[model samples]
Target: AASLAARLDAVFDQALRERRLVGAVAIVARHGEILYRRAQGLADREAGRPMREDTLFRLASVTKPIVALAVLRLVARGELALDAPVTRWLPEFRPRLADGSEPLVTIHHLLTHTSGLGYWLLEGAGSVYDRLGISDGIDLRDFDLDENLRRLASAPLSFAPGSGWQYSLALDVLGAVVERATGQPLAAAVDALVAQPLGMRDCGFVSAEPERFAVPYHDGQPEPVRMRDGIEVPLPEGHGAAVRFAPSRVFEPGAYPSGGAGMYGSADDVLRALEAIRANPGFLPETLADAARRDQAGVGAETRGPGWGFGYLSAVLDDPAAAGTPQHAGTLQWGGVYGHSWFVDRALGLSVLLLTNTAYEGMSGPLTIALRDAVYA
Candidate 1:
């Protein structure tokens, strides 16, 4: 593991030198023990700030896993049911098809991303979703939670519920469910249910200290660019296109807490969440915690890619040989748009976390692959 630590330094330092990433915090753990944890590069380049172990990062889609935990907690408490239709909580969330047909979308569909709701980021440029101001709930926009969901509800389904897998704002809808079922806002409900019990002090929709935020950086072709403090149109062109990001709205006092993409947290806090899920740390019931590791999506319908299957709020690895990695099977993983990736390898009691300020460079780039490979080497 120490040797792997050196390789991690080498790999991430090279990325920093090449400006592929502005800064990062990486951690590798096994059996709930942190084997290696380190931070590198500038947390804020123009401000000449260096990355610290406690620097806060926009968790992006990584928020999904944590929010999923909260929903599952509600399930155990009998406040919510996974098989219950979303209308049980969100009665107004009735999206129609192109032929004007409404389908029964279940809580299970939202948890599995099988609700046929896709993100504007995944659509073509100037697509209908974009034109309708359908936010992926990540940017620094001002649309409140209810307004955004209304916009989302107005859009047609990408496909019939439970028939496909597309990364969508289903979790944001789940946020509304969490609020309705708990009779509290998203942040408060999660606090009373998940974060408080798990000892994740730095994890939340709005950070208590905004000054500690790692400046958002977009991975450019030749370098990276820091975004301004307004609307962030990340990937305005298409895949691999120059992107933009902002950090202000995330800290706004009354900003809509997007259960899908709105979160700022430290690597240690995220590790705590993973450990709770991996070790059955008592934040959730044993049976539901075990169910979280199972593959919820069928073959050819999984969202993560060729070798991974969709578990509750994560992509589970079913074939190590096909994934071309050293980790054992049943490794649950996912990432965020603000350049973060994490996985919990249940078979080995291992987990790896990477949180950075570089866009695709940290989320889907080569360094992510290298870090995953280094863990099991």
Candidate 2:
């Protein structure tokens, strides 16, 4: 265990020294016992605020699993059905396919990102999503949730729901469904269903302690730069549209809760939520919890590349060799564009969380791979 700590420490140190990340909190746990944990670098470089265990981060897509869990909870309680048409809850959110046929999109499709709804970042410039000014749930926009969904519905879907997979705004749409189903706002629904139950006090759309929120940063040559609103940062290779950020969106009360990307939380909060799902401590039925971690989307889906398939919460590893990771098969992994990554490997009883202030580098760059390798080494 000492050697494991040393290995992880080295990786964290290198990332800070090399300016690959501005600040970060990394946690690794096995069998529900924390094996290694560290908070390093500057949460606010300009303010000289060092990172701390309780510092909150803009979760970005890391918000997915938390929100997904809320939906699953609703499913468990019979408040929502996985196979029910989304139209049942959100009758107005009817996006049609290219052929102009409106097919049924189920709660399952939204959870697995198979709803054929597309993200603005992945659609490239001048695409309908861009033209429609659709918020991919990260950018600052004047419109409310209903208005955004109206625009989303105005556009044609990439493919029929459940026929093809696309990283999308499906969760944002699902957020609306959650509101209708629970008779509460998306934030309140998630809190009642998941956060409150898991004791994740710091997990929500609004920051509990705004001062503890880490200053967002983007990768830069000499060092990471503090992110400003409307900064367009290119995603790593294979991703099309550059991510346009609105670092201030979290502070806006009117900004609709984006179930896909709008949450602020501490590393501990994230760890608790994931660990509960992985451990299945009666938060959800064993059958449903097991189903959440298993690959719901078939192998042909190619969720995160070869050997990956979409599960209810994250991409489930179908083949570690093909995905080029040492994590065991059945491991579920995903990252947020806001420089956060996490994985739960039931086979190894391991859960790792990395939350950083830097953007793509912390999310998908060398540091994430290095940290994963160190854990297995």
Candidate 3:
């Protein structure tokens, strides 16, 4: 364990020396035993607040799998059906295709990101989605989820529902669907459906204690730069402005609770959730667990990086050789925009989690690669 710890320490130290990360928490557990856990770097570099095991983060898309678990719980109660049309709850969602025909959008399509909806952050400049002002719910927009969905309904879909794959705001739609089905708000429903059952104390749509949250930062050249709170910037992608970043949206209770991107939790809580899924503690049916373990996105879709496939709320490892990673096949994984990554390797009964204060760099760049290499070593 000490040898593995040295490798992990060196990876993080090198990244910190290069100014690619502010501070982070990394944990690795196997077979119900924690192999390693470390907290290092700065939680708020400007404030000189060092990162700690208790630091909370704006989870970004990491919220998807947790919300997906809640949705599947509803399936267990027979309150929702994966194959059922989403319009049964969201009748206002009548998005048309380029050919002027609107098709049914199902819960499965939302979970698989084949619902024809999309995020502007992933779009090129001046694209239709950008023109529509589609917020991915990570930004500090004044509108709630309902208004956002209203705007979404006004846009033409990129393709027919289930015809293609696009990482989208479909989970926000599913959040609204959850509210409609349960007669409760998205946050309350999620708490009742998953958090409470799993004893995820610090996991919720709103951070009960903002003081404990880590500040968001962007890894800029020459030096680390703090992303201005509530500041939104449009970045050019393909001939027009397509992407924007708004990191302060996580602190607001007045804003919409986006099932896709809006949630806050500690690294420990997330690890517990993954352990539950891996252990099959019966929060969901065996059939649902089996379904989550399989690839829902077919060929020609975005998948587990190079050699992975898309499952209900994560990338399931399909080909270890294709992935070129040390993780074995059947590993379920995903990450967040605010520099968080996690994976559950059921085959090995191993789970690895990292939450950092730097964007892009912590989540997907050198830190992640280095950590994976260290773990394999």
The prediction achieving the highest TM-score against the true structure is 2
Q: Estimate each model's TM-score.
A: 0.94, 0.98, 0.95
lDDT tens per residue, model 3, 208-229: 5767988888768786678775
Q: For candidate 1, lDDT tens digit of each residue in 28-68?
A: 88897778889899899999999998899889988999999
lDDT of 1 at 130: 81
| Model 2 Cα shift for residue 176 (angstroms) | 0.7
Number of backbone clashes in candidate 3? 4
Cα RMSD to native, each candidate?
A: 2.1, 1.0, 2.3
Summed backbone clashes in each candidate are 0, 0, 4
**lDDT of model number 2:** 0.89
Clashes of 2: 0
C-alpha-based local distance difference test score of model 1: 0.83
User: How would you encode candidate 2's per-residue C-alpha lDDT over 246-292 as one tens digit per residue?
Assistant: 98889888888998999999899999998997898889998999899
Error of 3 at 269 (Å): 0.6
- In model 3, where is the ten-residue run with the lowest total lDDT? 234-243
lDDT for model 3 comes to 0.82
